């Protein structure tokens, strides 16, 4: 009933603008060996390695589709995109160029239709976290002070003050995403995190599970003073045989608290670490490769 955080690396193509500025690829990517080489000498393996020619459907199948199955069994699941601004986190998460969220939701509604013995309800929330304050992207608006994050006796995360919207189909999900994304604007989204949470309630007793799709703030850098370092500390602890049997340090950030029942342990979690191949990005790409390695 227990599982490790799975780490995928997704390397995007060199963009036309990077090529026109004279940059070249610094990455040799070997997807069928599960590894990459940075520069001459730096080798990194990961559970999944996706090269520049892996399309969106391939990413979804490799990384995500197995989570959707656990979610329907009553497990909590989280997929989060990590990496520097410009590396492809939003393109990947998608919230045939569509990303993970629409693919996962299309499949979820088909599964609901297939399991005809169950009476299922799906509802969604969409939240932004910026400087440890929440904004509810689905609400006409809500004071940050009025949103609170709590935990029940059974260890379940409980949101207070957050709008939950029942959804019966992909079209309704897409409309809510469109609305929330427009509301986000009116502080630079590369600097904030977003969490789209899908809750599935199934009855023959009630079985409730959560699937979080997380597009993180940019990882670029100028102990544990940032939400990304808090997340790193949590996933490092989960991946370390000496630390993983002890208390996992979720309390240090709202991003790890909101995911506390969804991150490692009895839940299923995938981190997609996105990297630019550009030589101009070498240092931040190394940072990302090292961060992702700490989770394994
Ligand atoms: N796998 C990919 N294939 C092609 N283009 C991509 C890929 N990933 C990202 N891009 C492009 O790169 C740019 C940066 O992607 P974006 O998703 O905004 O990054 P981030 O959210 O990490 O800042 C966008 O113009 C996007 O369309
Ligand atoms: Mg983005």
Residue numbers in the entry: 9 to 103, 112 to 202, 209 to 226, 239 to 256, 271 to 344
Text of the article:
Kif7, a member of the kinesin 4 superfamily, is implicated in a variety of diseases including Joubert, hydrolethalus and acrocallosal syndromes. Members of the kinesin superfamily of motor proteins (Kifs) move unidirectionally along microtubules (MTs) in an ATP-dependent manner. Kif7, a critical regulator of mammalian Hh signalling, acts as both a positive and negative regulator in the Hh signalling pathway but performs this role differently from Cos2 in that it does not interact with Smo or Fu.
Of the seven Kif7 and Kif27 constructs used for crystallization, only Kif78–347, which lacks the neck linker region, yielded crystals. Kif78–347 crystallized as a monomer with one molecule per asymmetric unit. Data were collected to 1.6 Å resolution and the structure thus belongs to a small group of kinesins solved to a higher resolution. The final structure included residues 12–347 (missing regions: 107–114, 207–211, 230–241, 260–273) with bound Mg2+ADP (octahedrally co­ordinated) in the catalytic site and 328 water molecules. In Kif5b the switch I region (residues 199–205) consists of a small helix (α3a), whereas in Kif7 it forms a loop (L9). Kif78–361 contained the neck-linker region but did not crystallize, whereas Kif78–347 lacking the neck linker revealed that the C-terminal residue Gln347 shows crystal contacts indicating that there would not be space for a neck linker in this crystal form.
